[PDB]
Design a protein around this ligand. Structure first.
Ligand SMILES: Nc1ncnc2c1ncn2[C@@H]1O[C@H](COP(=O)(O)OP(=O)(O)OP(O)(O)=S)[C@@H](O)[C@H]1O
Ligand SMILES: Nc1ncnc2c1ncn2[C@@H]1O[C@H](COP(=O)(O)OP(=O)(O)OP(O)(O)=S)[C@@H](O)[C@H]1O
Ligand SMILES: Nc1ncnc2c1ncn2[C@@H]1O[C@H](COP(=O)(O)OP(=O)(O)OP(O)(O)=S)[C@@H](O)[C@H]1O
Ligand SMILES: Nc1ncnc2c1ncn2[C@@H]1O[C@H](COP(=O)(O)OP(=O)(O)OP(O)(O)=S)[C@@H](O)[C@H]1O
Lengths: 728, 195, 184, 344
């Protein structure tokens, strides 16, 4: 006896979408009869457990319609944005829909139908629809010129309801007021599941095009590999930083490519235990091949197939491989699918899943650059027109310039946070406000940037205390050198690819304690912004075996995320302290890994590496081999003019002018004072002032005398020596 | 290979020599052998003790080494282990000097690969004798400093100037100083003669 | 056409125009599986020669070796960089020889509990003994016989290695069977 | 409901003589029922991972016969060299084996059977045996007038889908010729396992006799020490550089001595779950106590019983060493048990 299934599958109605069939669902005759649904009767078709599309049920052909397969004309699917592969649910309609009185019909192209078509076209299409439901698309309507076609939709309808996706009506010719419209979408109040498009995910153009190539080759031109014979690239791994847009891109491929989408693999599976899940998985890839060109997505491939660190495995990793080895059949016969994986962390998949025949191709989304973020913000803000007023174009380059390090999910977060703060301050400035007068201002957004920290900061931890070159007295020479030697090769990489220049990969900053080394590093990091990733000695090292190696390789892995970029190894002398020159027992692995990586980075690809030390000869000579880190810059004690700039900055709120504290005396008395000590002399002067009479108004020269008599300097057999020697 | 690892202390040298000897005649090279294995006889005593032993046991021994010559390089020859200078491991010894005026002409030509200083600016031939005390990897330094300075004036697309090379002359002092002349000739009166 | 790798035609005499051609392969549109022969293995002529000797000696002529009372060199092991024609050499050895090709798959030969892993190994070696000559391929033998000195090794590794030790050292002196292992 | 064992313990018959019980394997009634091995029917018993021996199943006394145990005669054990305590499979054979036409018989001692025994003796032995397979040894057969005893071997059997370690044949008096031979071993065609013996061990003569003494007196003559008021020596350790033949001695001791043979193959007992390594040792020593005499082998003792004081020996090594110490000398007793260990 026939058994009625609980779930169904969408497949395309094979005939051209015209006539009464445009609102009919051809369903397996056994299913319809078992449902007690007669052919030519109304039923609601929609996703499992959700609202659906009222459509006439018709009996299919058992040889054409497998038991669970259902064919909806593209008109029906476009209402619910149903993709071919969406699992459906069937329910009988209880009440006949009412007749229409007024209908608004428009084109997605936005072209004036009044300028192209006659109303007889709309009469024909609506009569064919029968039971109107807003959101249907009438597709490729050729103009009188013949060289053009138009897309048309029911933008609105009305008559002068349960589980219906949008209010349906019955067309009856002559009695309905057909009206034209320029609207490309249906009435917003219908709350429709609007499609997703490349007009939304824009901001990753080149990888979008590469994805389109990876859909062209396995869907459209599998035949074109039967000749040339060679095995095709039929596994894709779309990796990238979390929140960059990977799932959105997979979703746009699913909805804008017209393949059948085989159901999402997901972290979830029946039982999530070996043996049981092995058959429940193979079924998904057994569903593949039979259908016309398809796309099986295996999103989160690190959660379904983890790395097998030492023994962590059910059977799922080898099960994926053994199944992919049959899924890779194609282009001789059954070349009707491609697999697209997504991941945040590609090195955490079992590496056997990237071998040839398996995911042998990748897309590698990165972090949006300075102009990428303007693309993102423009396309995102385009969803608001009546409530922004402040975008005009400028001030948005300002947001995109100040919003460095946002991955794209954080710009969406920024927009929503700005909206929330706008509402909050609107209801805060007064007890009540007109909701529709609300508008997201640059004041709102620039305030919201304070709260929304980037998601990157929770994995890419960085201090960057926001110093500027105005906060580094003197060191004009060092600012010039840093410009020349890091900022130009960072930003000007293409020009060097033209000019053949060699960028000084690796600059080592060496100098006495308390000079401008890390201060200049921070100022460079924030002033003239670039990505700026650093590590510490005491954090790369862990008690357990091999955890330090993994940390270093992971640091470089994460560093790959952007360019131009400076890696900053402060106190590099505590990464290579020993175990190479002496005590070479079993634990120099950290130096091994770092010294391996330093070679892999290309000379002008965009990444540069900066390091600092006040113990130059403690650095293992392995690092100073040319090609690694051979460039050195000396950061010595400040000269007379530098010290006076430090004094002027740090005595700013001291009324030195009124009190007669002539800086040009302090700047020379403080000879040999290395940076921090010039700053300290001014703190001590202030404390001497406050202790004399709390509630101070100004500080005076006698306080500076007291400060000076208490400060001592560095060691001249260690400073001005052991660096002059290291210069040789 | 000099580093202290399981397969580097006394193994990697053997593997390298086995690959080289197994091949056709070879000119195996030992960049900076002086720094590689120092004298270790009371002055500059490194802690390896293994790699020099591997070389001593490989070069002098049963192996055929038909088509093999071991060339090496050094800038502090006084630091080489005495086990190398004497015939048996190294028995030929010659000296390489920084380029002369015409060698400096053609090294200046070599430095440029995508610049048109000659027709637009100053002739490369003009620079031939201008570079004094600049070693083969230091005329490169003058040219590269000039190239970095080029991207500071126009910043997008330009030739270089004579003053670019003049700044190269200042910013990089005389490289080949008399100190190395004296140190060599002192060592050479020993290497050249029987003393 | 469906579910047929290629559609035949019932050759009948009288009008079938037998036009001979210089092509060395079947029609390309269908892409019937191409054999992985020796002429697709270039770069390892000396190594393939050594492999050929090691396969032939225990496989075809073990009897004359066995007259000396010590077991043939049945066990061959391939190792080297993990990208250089390892599984491809095993596949060509499978294709070219006319010897019954068995296979010791890594994961799929093992079910659960007891008497399943040893049952699989016993059954496969016994079948390789019934049908001769035969080759027993173990690609990535490491994944099933680690040192037992690492935390990776558990019960299953102990089962696989014990069964292999019992079998491979037991059969011999008449069986025309070779066991070829490869490893990264 | 009853649960049939996944693996079975070999054991000997109480009857040491030759009769119609020879080729019979005494299996527990419930196991007979669960594999549907009806009593009297043919079944195959062979070590895990090796081909089986055909044996005809009888029942054991349901209250005194342990579920794990199949009992086999020395004749049948000689085929596969099954040592006591080996873990056997048991599987139904839906077959009737072929009749014999020519059966070849030999003797370990190489003496002429026509001179030593009457052919009616051999005929009766085969007729009662029920089944004939190459490799069987009928030990301790008396010579003429009881002059001595001789061991007789079925060197080969010939007749003019299951898989067997030795071909099964049936003896049908008169119609299957008992042709004599002098080959002291079974036909080399068959790859029958061949017992390792002390004659294969070189040197170590004094050590070999020391092993013989310390294995024989504790297991096969304890009442001599109980008579003398001293305990038996329950322990031997073999030490010396690798490659000197330590495991060879353990294997020959296993294969030569008539005792329950158990083996702790260092890391083979180890588990990552808290108490399971210790539980494996307790089960091994309780089995040795249960079936006596028993020899427990520990090859590379140092792998599972490290110094317990050095740095790398934590709690797990401490607990495994404590288990070994308490199972050798503690509040529990030993029995006729000897532990033989080897270490580098
Ligand atoms: N043009 C855009 N480019 C990138 N992200 C965008 C864009 N416009 C909006 N976003 C949003 O950014 C978020 C990105 O989320 P996902 O695509 O799920 O992140 P993801 O890269 O897949 O990270 P996961 O960790 O792998 S789920 C979504 O909410 C997008 O809608
Ligand atoms: N204009 C300035 N020039 C030099 N140092 C300054 C200046 N202004 C502030 N400082 C101080 O300089 C210090 C930074 O000194 P550093 O040389 O970077 O320390 P370091 O011990 O040499 O190595 P690290 O990387 O800081 S651990 C900070 O404590 C600042 O307060
Ligand atoms: N001479 C050759 N050396 C190496 N690879 C070759 C050679 N000739 C062809 N190949 C190709 O190399 C590809 C990969 O070689 P494989 O042997 O499959 O890799 P692998 O040997 O399995 O490596 P592993 O990880 O050690 S098992 C195959 O698809 C061959 O077509
Ligand atoms: N007389 C002999 N003395 C020693 N070894 C022999 C002798 N005759 C044969 N052998 C072989 O030498 C080996 C002796 O066994 P091994 O286990 O290797 O010795 P062992 O290493 O002391 O024992 P281990 O370390 O626990 S495996 C085996 O491969 C034997 O086949």
């Amino acid at each position: 006896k026939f058994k009625l299934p609980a779930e169904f599958i969408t497949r395309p109605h094979p005939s051209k979408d015209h006539g009464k069939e445009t609102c009919t669902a051809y369903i397996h005759p056994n299913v319809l009869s078992s449902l007690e649904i007669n052919p030519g009767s109304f039923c609601t078709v929609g996703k499992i457990g959700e609202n659906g599309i009222l459509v006439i049920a018709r009996a299919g052909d058992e040889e054409v319609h497998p038991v669970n397969v259902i064919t909806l004309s593209t008109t029906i699917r476009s209402v619910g944005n149903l993709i071919l592969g969406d699992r459906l649910e069937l329910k009988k309609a209880q009440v006949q829909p009412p007749y229409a009185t007024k209908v608004t019909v428009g084109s997605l192209q936005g072209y004036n139908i009044l300028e192209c078509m006659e109303e007889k076209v709309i009469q024909k299409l609506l009569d064919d629809s029968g039971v109107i439901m807003p959101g249907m698309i009438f597709q490729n309507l050729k103009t009188k010129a013949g060289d053009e076609s138009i897309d048309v939709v029911i933008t609105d309808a009305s008559d002068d309801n349960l589980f219906y996706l949008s209010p349906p009506f019955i067309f009856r010719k002559g009695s309905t007021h057909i009206t034209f419209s320029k609207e490309t979408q249906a009435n917003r109040k219908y709350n429709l599941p609007e499609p997703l498009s490349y007009a939304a995910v824009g901001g990753l153009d080149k990888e979008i095009e590469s994805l389109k190539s990876a859909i062209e080759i396995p869907l459209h031109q599998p035949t074109l590999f039967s000749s040339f014979g060679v095995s095709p690239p039929r596994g894709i791994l779309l990796h990238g930083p979390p929140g960059t847009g990977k799932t959105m891109l997979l979703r746009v491929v699913a909805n804008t490519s017209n393949a059948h989408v085989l159901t999402i693999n997901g972290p979830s599976i029946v039982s999530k235990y070996l043996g049981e899940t092995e058959a429940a998985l193979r079924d998904i890839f057994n569903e593949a091949r039979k259908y016309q060109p398809s796309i099986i997505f295996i999103d989160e491939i690190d959660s379904i197939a983890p790395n097998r660190a030492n023994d962590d495995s059910g059977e799922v990793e080898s099960r994926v491989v053994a199944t992919l080895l049959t899924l890779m059949d194609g282009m001789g016969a059954a070349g009707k699918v491609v697999v697209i994986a997504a991941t945040n962390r590609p090195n955490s998949v079992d590496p056997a899943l990237r071998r040839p025949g398996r995911f042998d191709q990748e897309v590698e989304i990165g972090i949006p650059d300075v102009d990428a973020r303007f693309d993102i913000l423009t396309k995102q803000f385009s969803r608001m027109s009546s409530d922004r007023h402040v975008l005009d174009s400028e001030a948005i380059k300002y947001i995109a310039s100040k919003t460095h390090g946002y991955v794209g999910a954080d710009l969406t977060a920024l927009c929503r946070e700005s909206v929330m703060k706008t509402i909050q301050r609107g209801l805060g400035t007064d007890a009540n406000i007109d909701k529709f007068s609300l508008k997201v201002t640059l004041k709102d957004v620039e305030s919201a940037m304070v709260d929304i920290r980037p998601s990157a900061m929770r994995e890419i931890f960085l201090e960057m205390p926001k110093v500027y070159w105005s906060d580094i007295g003197g060191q004009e020479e060092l600012k010039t050198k840093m410009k020349e030697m890091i900022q130009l090769p960072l930003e000007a990489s293409e020009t060097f690819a033209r000019l053949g220049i060699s960028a000084p990969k690796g600059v080592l900053l060496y100098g006495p304690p308390g000079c401008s080394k890390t201060l200049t590093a921070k100022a460079l990091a924030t002033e003239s912004g670039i990505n700026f990733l650093a590590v510490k000695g005491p954090e790369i090292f862990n008690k357990y075996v091999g955890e330090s190696e993994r940390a270093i390789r992971e640091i470089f892995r994460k560093a790959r995320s952007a360019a131009p970029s400076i890696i900053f190894f402060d106190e590099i002398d505590a990464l290579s302290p020993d175990r190479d020159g002496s005590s070479t027992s079993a634990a120099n692995h950290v130096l091994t890994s770092l010294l391996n990586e330093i070679d892999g980075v290309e000379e002008l690809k965009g990444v540069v590496i900066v390091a600092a030390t006040n113990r130059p000869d403690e650095i293992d000579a392995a690092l100073l081999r040319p090609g690694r880190l051979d460039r050195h810059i000396y950061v010595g004690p400040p000269d007379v003019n530098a010290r006076l700039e430090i004094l002027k900055k740090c005595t700013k709120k001291f009324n030195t002018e009124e009190s007669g504290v002539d800086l040009h005396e302090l700047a020379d008395r403080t000879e040999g004072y290395s940076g921090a000590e010039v700053v300290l002399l001014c703190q001590e002067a202030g404390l001497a002032a406050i202790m004399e009479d709390l509630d101070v108004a100004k500080v005076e020269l006698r306080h500076f005398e007291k400060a000076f008599k208490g400060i001592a300097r560095g060691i001249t057999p260690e400073m001005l020596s052991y660096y002059e020697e290291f210069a040789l | 290979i000099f580093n202290k690892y399981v397969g580097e202390s006394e193994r990697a040298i053997r593997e390298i020599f086995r690959k080289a000897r197994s091949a056709a005649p070879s000119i195996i090279f030992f960049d900076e052998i002086d720094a590689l294995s120092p004298d270790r006889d009371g002055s500059s005593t490194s802690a390896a003790n293994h790699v020099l032993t591997s070389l001593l046991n490989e070069i002098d021994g049963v192996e055929e080494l038909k088509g093999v010559v071991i060339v090496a390089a050094t800038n502090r020859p006084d630091e080489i282990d005495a086990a190398l200078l004497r015939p048996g491991r190294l028995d030929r010894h010659i000296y390489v000097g920084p380029p002369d005026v015409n060698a400096r002409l053609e090294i200046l030509k070599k430095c440029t690969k995508k610049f048109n200083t000659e027709e637009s600016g100053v002739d490369l031939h003009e620079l031939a004798d201008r570079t004094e005390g600049y070693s083969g990897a230091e005329v490169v330094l003058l040219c590269q400093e000039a190239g970095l300075a080029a991207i500071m004036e126009d910043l997008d697309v330009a030739k270089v100037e004579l003053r670019h090379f003049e700044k190269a002359f200042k910013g990089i002092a005389r490289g080949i100083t008399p100190e190395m002349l004296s140190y060599y000739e002192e060592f050479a009166l020993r290497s050249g003669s029987s003393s």
